[PDB]
Amino acid sequence: PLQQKLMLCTLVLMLRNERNKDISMGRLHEVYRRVCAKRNILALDQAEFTGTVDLVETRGILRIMRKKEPRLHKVLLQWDEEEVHAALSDKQLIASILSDTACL
């Protein structure tokens, strides 16, 4: 799906550009919203974004460490980045998202 593609691309971008890999759901949602607003696609709110990341967790690409609040859930990528680049198969979008450091 398109929104799971945009979620995985921002997680790869946040892990590539930042050396702190403790990504929360709100900190990922803030970068996802700016990436979506750059491409002029309407972004989901936090409530649909949490379910989207929960659906990507079922494929085994992620592992969500549960906390007391849903904003503070910790996303942990459990594939290497080349597997994500081969699984998304949309390199025209992936190369466009990874080059946009300024929205972080």
Partner 1 sequence: TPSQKMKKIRAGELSPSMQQRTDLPAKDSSKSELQLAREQLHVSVVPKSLPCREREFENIYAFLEGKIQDQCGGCMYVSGVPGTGKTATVTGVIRTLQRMAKQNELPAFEYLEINGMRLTEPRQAYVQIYKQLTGKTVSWEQAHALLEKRFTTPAPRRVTTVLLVDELDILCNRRQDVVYNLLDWPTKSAAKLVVVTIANTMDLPERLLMGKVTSRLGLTRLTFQPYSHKQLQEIVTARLGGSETFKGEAVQLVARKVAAVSGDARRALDICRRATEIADTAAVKCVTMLHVQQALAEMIASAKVQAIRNCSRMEQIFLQAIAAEVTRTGVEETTFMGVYQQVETIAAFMGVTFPPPGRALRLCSKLGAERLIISEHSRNDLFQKILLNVSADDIHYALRV
Partner 2 sequence: PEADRELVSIRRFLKERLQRDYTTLRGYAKERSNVRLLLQRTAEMGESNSLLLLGPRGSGKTTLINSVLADLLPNKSFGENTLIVHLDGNLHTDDRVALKSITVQMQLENAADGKVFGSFAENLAFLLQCLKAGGKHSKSVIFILEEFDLFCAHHNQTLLYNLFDVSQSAQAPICVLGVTCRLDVIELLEKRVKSRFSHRQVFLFPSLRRFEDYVDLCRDLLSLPTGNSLLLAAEKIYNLQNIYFSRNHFDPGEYGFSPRLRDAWNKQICKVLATQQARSTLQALHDFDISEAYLKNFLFRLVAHLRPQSPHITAEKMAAVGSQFEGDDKIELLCGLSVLELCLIIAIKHHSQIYDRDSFNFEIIYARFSKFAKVSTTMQAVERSIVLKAFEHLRIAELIMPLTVQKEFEMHKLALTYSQIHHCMQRYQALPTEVAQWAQS
Where on the chain is the footprint of partner 2 (CB under 8 A)?
46-47, 50-51, 54-55, 58, 70
Query: To the nearest whole angstrom, how small is the minimum distance from the Cβ of residue 40 to partner 1?
Result: 14
The secondary structure of 1-22 as a DSSP string is -HHHHHHHHHHHHHHHH-S---
Does the protein bind partner 1 through residue 18 (CB under 8 A)? no
Q: Which is nearer to partner 2, 12 or 56 (CB)?
A: 56
Does the protein bind partner 1 through residue 80 (CB under 8 A)? no
Nearest to 29 by CA among 15, 16, 10, 13: 10
Q: For the chain, where are the E strands, in sequence order? A: 23-24, 62-65, 74-77
Q: Which is nearer to partner 2, 26 or 93 (CB)?
A: 26
Does the protein bind partner 1 through residue 96 (CB under 8 A)? no
